[PDB]
Amino acid sequence: RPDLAWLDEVTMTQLERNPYEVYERLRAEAPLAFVPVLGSYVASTAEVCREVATSPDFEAVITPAGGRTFGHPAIIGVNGDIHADLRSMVEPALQPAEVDRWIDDLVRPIARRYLERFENDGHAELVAQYCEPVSVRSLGDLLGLQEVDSDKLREWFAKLNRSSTNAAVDENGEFANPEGFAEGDQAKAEIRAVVDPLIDKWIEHPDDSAISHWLHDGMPPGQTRDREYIYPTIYVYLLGAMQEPGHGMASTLVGLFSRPEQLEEVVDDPTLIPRAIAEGLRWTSPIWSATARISTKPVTIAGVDLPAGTPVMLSYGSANHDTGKYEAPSQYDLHRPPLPHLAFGAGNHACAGIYFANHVMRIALEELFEAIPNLERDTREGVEFWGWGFRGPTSLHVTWE
Ligand code: HEM
Numbered sequence: 001r002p003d004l005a006w007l008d009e010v011t012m013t014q015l016e017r018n019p020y021e022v023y024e025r026l027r028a029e030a031p032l033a034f035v036p037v038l039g040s041y042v043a044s045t046a047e048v049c050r051e052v053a054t055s056p057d058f059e060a061v062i063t064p065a066g067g068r069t070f071g072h073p074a075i076i077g078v079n080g081d082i083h084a085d086l087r088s089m090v091e092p093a094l095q096p097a098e099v100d101r102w103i104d105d106l107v108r109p110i111a112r113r114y115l116e117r118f119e120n121d122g123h124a125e126l127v128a129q130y131c132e133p134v135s136v137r138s139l140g141d142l143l144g145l146q147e148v149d150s151d152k153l154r155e156w157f158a159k160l161n162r163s164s165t166n167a168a169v170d171e172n173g174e175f176a177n178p179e180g181f182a183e184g185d186q187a188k189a190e191i192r193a194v195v196d197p198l199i200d201k202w203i204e205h206p207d208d209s210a211i212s213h214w215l216h217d218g219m220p221p222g223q224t225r226d227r228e229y230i231y232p233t234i235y236v237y238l239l240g241a242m243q244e245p246g247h248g249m250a251s252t253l254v255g256l257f258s259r260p261e262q263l264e265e266v267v268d269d270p271t272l273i274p275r276a277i278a279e280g281l282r283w284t285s286p287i288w289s290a291t292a293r294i295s296t297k298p299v300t301i302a303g304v305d306l307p308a309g310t311p312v313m314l315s316y317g318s319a320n321h322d323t324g325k326y327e328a329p330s331q332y333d334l335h336r337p338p339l340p341h342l343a344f345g346a347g348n349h350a351c352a353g354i355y356f357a358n359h360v361m362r363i364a365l366e367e368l369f370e371a372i373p374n375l376e377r378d379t380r381e382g383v384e385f386w387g388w389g390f391r392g393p394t395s396l397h398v399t400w401e
């Protein structure tokens with residue numbers, strides 16, 4: 001596409017540090033565009049993302065670096081009968097009525113546990129000390145990984161993050177940085193060493209943990225799903241399910257700090273926390289561009305005639321700054337009207353844990369503002385956001401009296 005020759009000069013590093021400038025151009029110039037360094041078409045607007053995600057002429061496909069990292073059958077990358085089975089496998093503990101039965105007793109004590117370590121220090125780095133630990137500990141306990149230290153869970157999602165977003169390709173469409181997959185392989189090897197003994201145990205002695213239910217639910221008597229069949233979805237969980245609620249909380253905090261009167265309102269009136277989180281998810285989408293669909297027949301989208309078999313990456317983080325939908329989208333605004341957003345995706349492969357994730361983020365922020373209501377950002381330290389596939393702040397230094 002000749003007028004997009006400037007896309008040839010876009011680098012992976014640039015997209016990781018800040019993708020919003022490139023994607024603002026894409027939204028205006030080519031809502032569906034082939035990005036050479038990513039080796040793929042990408043959808044940048046809300047209209048195109050939603051259309052691709054819900055179209056009957058498209059089905060799920062894993063991103064190339066996602067597939068190299070997760071293998072088969074990752075719930076995000078399969079369709080038909082296998083997807084239906086994996087959806088019914090993960091859905092019971094995520095059902096709203098079920099979450100409402102125990103989410104409070106799960107997350108609130110965990111939030112208190114981590115707050116107690118620093119709430120009187122007067123200084124903290126909330127990503128490492130609060131947002132990520134609460135996120136991984138809550139889901140870890142739900143999964144049956146109580147004995148896996150929160151530092152380990154955080155290290156796993158960081159390595160799987162970097163591996164699955166190791167997307168750069170060279171002039172011949174080959175992965176430019178194949179060594180970047182090695183730490184994804186190392187994380188998987190460690191996960192196998194830890195989780196395989198637990199699966200051995202759950203096969204014979206099922207309990208209340210989610211993974212035990214993944215092995216047993218809906219199976220003939222005495223039978224379990226093969227572990228190779230469920231491991232890629234375990235990996236999917238140990239990346240995005242572990243990582244995203246922590247990044248959603250932190251981005252919401254960074255956005256509130258950017259609007260000090262709005263932060264005061266939320267501390268004064270914690271019933272506004274769910275609305276603050278929804279704006280946070282739109283403002284810096286935790287899953288920014290990590291999933292994709294592939295066309296199953298010839299289709300025309302945003303004026304581009306796509307052949308069958310064409311992958312399209314869904315850059316929901318860009319769709320969420322669509323100026324056809326939002327005014328001044330790069331500005332966090334609690335009082336934006338409650339409009340649809342794509343931070344949870346859309347269609348048959350839309351996020352399965354929305355209700356759970358929203359409560360995890362809500363409860364964590366509630367307990368934070370109660371313990372430290374004079375929270376202030378440490379304006380001596382800058383907040384840098386990182387990631388093209390998954391995006392969030394690398395740290396969040398705060399102070400208080
Ligand atoms: C703030 C937190 C979260 C955000 C923003 C988020 C966002 C997303 C997005 C954008 C997708 C891809 C949707 C698409 O391709 O159309 C996805 C998929 C998924 N998420 Fe969430 N997620 C979050 C937390 C969680 C949690 C905590 C869990 C599990 C407890 C979870 C389970 C899943 C599953 C199973 C899928 C795959 C759905 C499928 O392909 O059928 N997510 N998520």
Ligand SMILES: COc1cccc(OC)c1O
Nearest residue numbers: 066164236239240241290
């Ligand atoms: C590419 O990896 C992922 C994509 C979307 C969601 C995930 O976890 C829920 C995830 O681990």
